[PDB]
Design a protein around this nucleic acid. Structure first.
Ligand SMILES: [Mg+2]
Ligand SMILES: [Mg+2]
Length: 191
DNA sequence: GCCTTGCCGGGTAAGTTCCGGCACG
DNA sequence: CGTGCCGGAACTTACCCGGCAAGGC
């Protein structure tokens, strides 16, 4: 289905390049944030925001999409308790994603945390359990891969997709038309 | 002789949570 | 008064990038 695919894609971006934040203020006021950050303003406004707006309308979320310009990056932000729990509940059920959602998620995670040269196929993260889930998904998809500690300074692991399966990964996962195409995959397909 | 990939250091593109507003039952 | 949406941005590092070289065929 369309909504679940777009959801899983966004979650990959969120978990990779953003986050889910439950805030308490003096008040005792509060706030619930769904966030994706990115240096490219275009990527946020043109690729990401329209997907998020679609999801917001489909879920009848009344919150608006904020785009905040930071010193080093743009922030796409939705301030919404409803949208926050929607992604947070999805995240704790992540092991139950069907094939379609898995691929959408892996696309999203790769856009966020991946080696964008596509010369090497790598995903970095400190969350080892998250990479190990993605690893099992990939193996099941016929894409071989390994996980090692890539940065001993900060505790950042890397998931390395074997170049032996580069074509399978790029064409059947990054380029699947069952959910939104990541930027470079879309560009390759249109040449 | 060349592809693959573990491992590394460089430094910036990310992430995280604080601030002061306002709305609404 | 209790709580949730706006809009901004200060502050630290978790990523990405790209080089090196061991290993393997
Ligand atoms: Mg990340
Ligand atoms: Mg990124």
């Amino acid at each position: 289905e369309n909504v679940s695919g777009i959801s899983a894609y966004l979650l990959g971006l969120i978990i990779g390049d953003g986050g889910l934040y439950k805030l308490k203020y003096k008040g005792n006021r509060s706030e619930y944030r769904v966030v994706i950050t990115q240096k490219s303003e275009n990527l946020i406004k043109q690729h990401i925001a329209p997907l998020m707006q679609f999801l917001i309308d489909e879920l009848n979320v009344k919150s608006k999409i904020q785009i905040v310009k930071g010193d080093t990056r743009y922030e796409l932000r939705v301030s919404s308790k409803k949208l926050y729990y929607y992604f947070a509940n999805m995240l704790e059920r992540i092991r139950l994603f069907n094939m379609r959602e898995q691929i959408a998620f892996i696309k999203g995670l790769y856009v966020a945390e991946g080696d964008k040269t596509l010369k090497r196929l790598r995903i970095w993260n400190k969350n080892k359990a998250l990479l190990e889930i993605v690893s099992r998904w990939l193996n099941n998809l016929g894409v071989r891969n390994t996980i090692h500690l890539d940065d001993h300074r900060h505790g950042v692991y890397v998931l390395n997709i074997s170049l032996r399966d580069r074509i399978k990964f790029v064409h059947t996962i990054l380029s699947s038309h069952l959910n939104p195409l990541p930027p470079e995959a879309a560009a390759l397909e249109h040449h």
